[PDB]
Amino acid sequence: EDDEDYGDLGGCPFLVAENKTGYPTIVACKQDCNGTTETAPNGTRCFSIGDEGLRRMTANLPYDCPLGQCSNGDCIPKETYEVCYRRNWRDKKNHHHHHH
Amino acid sequence: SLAADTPTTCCFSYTSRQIPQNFIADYFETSSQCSKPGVIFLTKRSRQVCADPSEEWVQKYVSDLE
Ligand code: NI
Ligand code: NI
């Protein structure tokens, strides 16, 4: 019951980089997972670094990341860059500080 | 693998069906700063899949992963 019954699982996550405060931006305007491909909506902010670009970045250090907008699955560069960071799931997890 | 050391993601859409529960190894929550809410399920085959946290099966599965 909604939407696909028994096709491919779909739900391709899009890798993101974040700014210093955690705001995420996708690094590719299309993602493949199994037989599925998804394109981000036209006009979405993107960094033109690719998934492999992101996987190459040292986690949690600043890079200058070229900014674009998605258009038919492709990130088209503008003239601007933003500092961005690769975070992994480990960086977001658990609660090892508390205050009394 | 470790899956915890793979990059954070956001979801634009969600899997269309309930994934068999015994096939799910772990989950991650996408950032509240993403454009849409998203739970990522990690299957036993290391696939990361977007799911809609408003769906009952999703909460149940999250809860059952203790
Ligand atoms: Ni500490
Ligand atoms: Ni204490």
Numbering used by the authors:
A (entry chain A): 1 to 100
B (entry chain B): 2 to 67
How is this structure described in the published paper?
In order to understand the structural basis of the chemokine binding mechanism by Evasin-1, we have crystallized the complex (accession code: 3 fpu) between Evasin-1 and a variant of the human chemokine CCL3. One monomer of Evasin-1 binds one monomer of CCL3 displaying a 1∶1 stoichiometry. Upon complex formation, the N-terminal region of CCL3 interacts with both the N-terminal and C-terminal regions of Evasin-1. The complex formation induces the stabilization of the entire N-terminal and C-terminal areas of Evasin-1 and of the N-terminal segment of CCL3, which becomes visible in the electron density maps, showing the rearrangement of both N-terminal ends upon binding. Due to interactions in the complex, the CCL3 N-terminal region (residues Ser2-Thr10) moves by almost 90 degrees with 5AlaB moving circa 20 Å. Three additional secondary structure elements are formed upon binding: the α2 3-10 helix at the C-terminal of Evasin-1; and the α0 3-10 helix and β0 strand at the N-terminal region of CCL3. Three specific residues of CCL3, Thr16B-Ser17B-Arg18B, are targeted by the N-terminal region of Evasin-1, through 7 hydrogen bonds. The N-terminal contacts include several hydrophobic interactions, one of which is an important edge-to-face π-π interaction between Phe14A from Evasin-1 and Phe13B from CCL3. The C-terminal of Evasin-1 embraces the N-terminal part of CCL3 due to an important network of hydrogen bonds and comprising a very important hydrophobic stacking interaction between the Trp89A from Evasin-1 and Phe29B of CCL3. The crystal structure reveals the C-terminal polyhistidine tag, and includes two metal ions, modelled as Ni2+ atom (believed to be leached from the IMAC resin during purification) and which play an important role in establishing the crystal lattice.
Evasin-1 is a small 94-amino acid protein which binds CCL3/MIP-1α and CCL4/MIP-1β with very high affinity (0.16 and 0.81 nM, respectively), and also displays lower affinity binding (3.2 nM) to a closely related member of the CC chemokine family, CCL18/ PARC.
